[PDB]
From Swiss-Prot:
Protein name as annotated: Uncharacterized protein YejG
Coiled-coil parts of chain: none
Domain of life the protein comes from: Bacteria
Lineage: Bacteria, Pseudomonadati, Pseudomonadota, Gammaproteobacteria, Enterobacterales
InterPro entries registered for this protein in UniProt: Uncharacterised_YejG (IPR020489)
Species name: Escherichia coli (strain K12)
Length: 113
């Protein structure tokens, strides 16, 4: 049902927080060698959108962070875009799917979980 499910990704890259803001910062890894599996992954704009899906997505990133799962949510105009750790891609879309909103997240290599 519906016909307006416009999902976009490109590549996760390996990036981190710039030790200034946490919740409002992103920067890549210029050849710095993290512990490894502690890269971040990022999501582009999605659709469909509405105040439901916005409010719920945001209230859920907060809720997930309340447990063990720091997720990041920022808009620009009409482009809600998202940031998660690593395994938190599949995990997030899995729990979010139950909440009924839409999401744009992959589930890592061919769903490896």
């Amino acid at each position: 049902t519906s016909l307006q499910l416009s999902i976009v990704h490109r590549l996760p890259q390996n990036y981190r927080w710039s030790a200034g803001f946490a919740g409002s910062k992103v920067e890549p890894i210029p050849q710095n060698g993290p512990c490894g599996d502690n890269s971040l992954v990022a999501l582009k704009l999605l659709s469909p959108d509405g105040d439901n899906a916005w409010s719920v997505m945001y209230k859920l990133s907060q809720a997930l962070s309340d447990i063990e799962v720091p997720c990041s949510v920022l808009e620009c105009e009409g482009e809600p875009c998202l940031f998660v750790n690593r395994q938190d891609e599949f995990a997030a879309t899995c729990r979010l799917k139950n909440f009924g909103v839409a999401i744009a997240e992959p589930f890592s290599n061919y769903n490896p979980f």
